[PDB]
């Protein structure tokens, strides 16, 4: 869980627009959201993990305990129920809302942090490099 700690900055994005479309994000919002190069800031305090995301589009921050369900207001304004687990050495986040569900996998690969967001077969890959 300590391998993800640090300040990462986006360097690559693929299929992010197809992914946002599937989750239901609006046309104009997908536009400005895709133009953003957010910075992910991960921190830990005891058994509490913090994932802060900062960008021009919107700033978000979720604090959680591994394996314990929590309420989350996503950047695109969805009120979802989240659950984050340390699965296969990767932080795997599942978001459930309105009968639908999406998985956000954050894994380490060498000097980078790969973020795979999936929704009904559509997959978006965003690569982060430590700032």
Q: Quickly tell me which residue has 């699965």 as its tokens.
A: 87
Q: Is 61 in the site for its own copies (CB under 8 A)?
A: yes
Q: Is 76 in the site for ligand 2AN (CB under 6 A)?
A: yes
The b/e string for 62-92 (b: 16+ C-beta within 10 A; e otherwise) is bebeeeeeeebebbeebebebbbeeeeebbb
Least separation, in Å, of the C-beta of 15 and its own copies?
A: 27
Q: Is 25 in the site for ligand 2AN (CB under 6 A)?
A: yes
Q: Which listed range, 45-53, 87-95, 96-104, 120-128, lies at the site for its own copies (CB under 8 A)?
A: 45-53
Strands (E), the chain: 6-14, 39-45, 48-54, 60-64, 70-73, 79-87, 90-97, 100-109, 112-119, 122-130
Q: Which is nearer to ligand 2AN, 53 or 64 (CB)?
A: 53
Point out which residues bind its own copies (CB under 8 A): 43, 45-46, 48, 50, 52, 54, 59-61, 63, 65, 71-73, 77, 79
């Amino acid at each position: 869980c300590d391998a993800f700690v640090g300040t990462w900055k986006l360097v690559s994005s693929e299929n992010f627009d197809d992914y946002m479309k599937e989750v239901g994000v609006g046309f104009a919002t997908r536009k400005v959201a895709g133009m953003a190069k957010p910075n992910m800031i991960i921190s830990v305090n005891g058994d509490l993990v913090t994932i802060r995301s900062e960008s021009t589009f919107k700033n978000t921050e979720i604090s959680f305990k591994l394996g314990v369900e929590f309420d989350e207001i996503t950047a695109d304004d969805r009120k979802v129920k989240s659950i984050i687990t340390l699965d296969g050495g990767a932080l795997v986040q599942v978001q459930k809302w309105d009968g639908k569900s999406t998985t956000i996998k954050r894994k380490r690969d060498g000097d980078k942090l790969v973020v795979e967001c999936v929704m009904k077969g559509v997959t978006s890959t965003r690569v982060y490099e430590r700032a």
